Curated annotation (Swiss-Prot):
Keywords, in A-Z order: Acetylation, Allosteric enzyme, Apoptosis, ATP-binding, Cell junction, Cell membrane, Cell projection, Chromosome, Cytoplasm, Cytoskeleton, Disease variant, Epilepsy, Exocytosis, Intellectual disability, Kinase, Membrane, Nucleotide-binding, Nucleus, Phosphoprotein, Serine/threonine-protein kinase, Transferase
Record note on quaternary structure: Homodimer; homodimerization results in autoinhibition. Active as monomer. Interacts with GIT1. Component of cytoplasmic complexes, which also contains PXN, ARHGEF7 and GIT1. Interacts with NISCH. Interacts with DVL1; mediates the formation of a DVL1, MUSK and PAK1 ternary complex involved in AChR clustering. Binds to the caspase-cleaved p110 isoform of CDC2L1 and CDC2L2, p110C, but not the full-length proteins. Interacts with ARHGEF7. Interacts tightly with GTP-bound but not GDP-bound CDC42/P21 and RAC1. Interacts with SCRIB. Interacts with PDPK1. Interacts (via kinase domain) with RAF1.
Name recorded for this polypeptide: Serine/threonine-protein kinase PAK 1
Disease connection: Intellectual developmental disorder with macrocephaly, seizures, and speech delay: An autosomal dominant neurodevelopmental disorder characterized by impaired intellectual development, poor speech, postnatal macrocephaly, and seizures.
């Protein structure tokens, strides 16, 4: 009930108006997710990202409540920090830390990452996934667009609008929520998928870092899914150009047999991650992609 939803949100949020706590707002996005602004927390100095949503015109308010509750109880260095929330009438405000280095998408479409840089990003993403999976949370929409970067090269996962919480019982999901091009075959070829769908998506993200886009980006999403389900593990355009350990890492992330596919815990031990360069090695790419917008 819209009424119950407001009472639930009322219990979650901090009290009052945020217009006092933040100052130099600046409107960025304005999609259907609500209006996003950059602003400054006046008491800590921290620059933040604030999403304002008019509730009565928000579709699935339960997903928003789920998102806040999951973020609040699953804080981690590799996840964009959820800071606070406020409700002013039917206006809901969600405050997140702001990362000034844009997203991984900007980097893969505007620059050329070397293997040491790719290994670093893959490691940081796997750290977030091991943490989430160990806490029974499946992100379900892993893709470069959901990987935000700090100017210092910090790598953090965001957008928990489609996550799932599982248990011993209800250990598998079946709802199709992810972005087509990054979806694991089992999301389609069957029902009941588990945490490893995020590992598959990470593998597609690695392909993005190598080739600039996920396989089949050129195709209608509807056709991509059929291809993903019928072609299975994607073929690289120039596999010979990659080191043997990077090819092995990709093979483990993109295996068709879910049981065979690596888990986050297993992949954090992979030798490909050991060639990772310091995260600050990403700063030049981030700066280049920020300028080339």
């Amino acid at each position: 009930s819209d009424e119950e939803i407001l009472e639930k949100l009322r219990s979650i949020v901090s009290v009052g108006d945020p217009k006092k706590k933040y100052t130099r707002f600046e409107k960025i996005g304005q999609g259907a997710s609500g209006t996003v602004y950059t602003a400054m927390d006046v008491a800590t100095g921290q620059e933040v990202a604030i999403r304002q949503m008019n509730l009565q015109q928000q579709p699935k308010k339960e997903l928003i409540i789920n998102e806040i509750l999951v973020m609040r109880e699953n804080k981690n260095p590799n996840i964009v920090n959820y800071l606070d929330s406020y409700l002013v009438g039917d206006e809901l405000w969600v405050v997140m830390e702001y990362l000034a280095g844009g997203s991984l998408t900007d980097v893969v479409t505007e620059t050329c990452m070397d293997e040491g840089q790719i290994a670093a990003v893959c490691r940081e993403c796997l750290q977030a996934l091991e943490f989430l999976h160990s806490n029974q949370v499946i992100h379900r929409d892993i893709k470069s667009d959901n990987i935000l970067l700090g100017m210092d090269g910090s790598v953090k996962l965001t957008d928990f609008g489609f996550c799932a919480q599982i248990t011993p019982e209800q250990s598998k999901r079946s709802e199709m929520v992810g972005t087509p091009y990054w979806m694991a075959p089992e999301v389609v070829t069957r029902k009941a998928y588990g945490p490893k769908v995020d590992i598959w998506s990470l593998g597609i993200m690695a392909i993005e870092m190598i080739e600039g886009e996920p396989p089949y980006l050129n195709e209608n999403p509807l056709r991509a899914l059929y291809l993903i389900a019928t072609n299975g593990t994607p073929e690289l355009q120039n596999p010979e150009k990659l080191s043997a350990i990077f090819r092995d890492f990709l093979n483990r992330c993109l295996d068709m047999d879910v049981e065979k596919r690596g888990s986050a815990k297993e992949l954090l031990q992979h030798q490909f991650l050991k060639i990772a360069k310091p995260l600050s090695s990403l700063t030049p790419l981030i700066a280049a992609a920020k300028e080339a917008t």
